[PDB]
C-alpha cells in the first residue's frame, strides 16, 4: 500500500494521529483515541517542548513529560506517559 494507507494502519493500530498543532510554536499535535478526546501539542525543537493539552495537565505532570522528551530524548516513552496521564484525566 501507499504511504497514506500505511499511515492509516498505524493510526488504527496505535489509535494515534499526528496532526498540525494549533500553535506556531508547538506545531505537532498528538491525538489519542477515537475522538478529539486526548491530545497534546509539542515542539520538535527547543528547551520548551510541551505545549497545550486536552485534558489540561498540572505543572508537575508537564515537567515530567518535558524531561522524557528533552532529557531522555525518547518519543515512545513520552507518548506512553502522556497517553496514560491524559486518559487518567478524562
Amino acid at each position: 500500500m501507499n504511504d497514506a494507507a500505511e499511515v492509516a494502519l498505524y493510526e488504527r493500530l496505535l489509535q494515534l494521529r499526528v496532526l498540525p498543532g494549533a500553535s506556531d510554536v508547538h506545531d505537532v499535535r498528538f491525538v489519542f483515541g477515537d475522538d478529539s478526546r486526548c491530545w497534546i501539542e509539542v515542539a520538535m525543537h527547543g528547551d520548551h517542548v510541551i505545549g497545550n493539552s486536552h485534558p489540561a495537565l498540572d505543572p508537575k505532570s508537564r515537567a515530567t513529560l518535558e524531561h522524557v522528551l528533552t532529557v531522555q530524548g525518547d518519543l515512545a516513552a513520552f507518548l506512553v506517559v502522556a497517553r496514560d496521564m491524559l486518559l487518567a484525566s478524562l
Binding site: 497514506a4 488504527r12 493500530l13 499526528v18
Partner: protein, 59 residues
C-alpha cells in the same frame, strides 16, 4: 519529502514496524534482539491490539 513520509518516519521511530509481507506488526522497543510479533488477524479486536502495543512500548 511529504507529510505522510514524515509521519511514517515518526511511527517507525517508536519501534513499531509494519510487516505486511507476513500479515503482522513488529514491536522493537529494546533493540536487543528481542521483538514482539502481533498478527494482523481480524480475530483479535482493534481494542486488544492497541492495548497490547501500548503495553509493549511502555516496557
Amino acid at each position: 519529502a511529504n507529510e505522510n513520509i514524515l509521519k511514517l518516519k515518526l511511527y517507525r521511530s517508536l519501534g513499531v514496524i509494519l510487516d505486511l509481507e507476513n500479515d503482522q506488526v513488529l514491536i522493537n522497543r529494546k533493540n536487543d534482539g528481542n521483538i514482539d510479533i502481533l498478527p494482523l488477524d481480524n480475530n483479535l479486536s482493534d481494542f486488544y491490539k492497541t492495548k497490547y502495543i501500548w503495553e509493549r512500548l511502555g516496557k
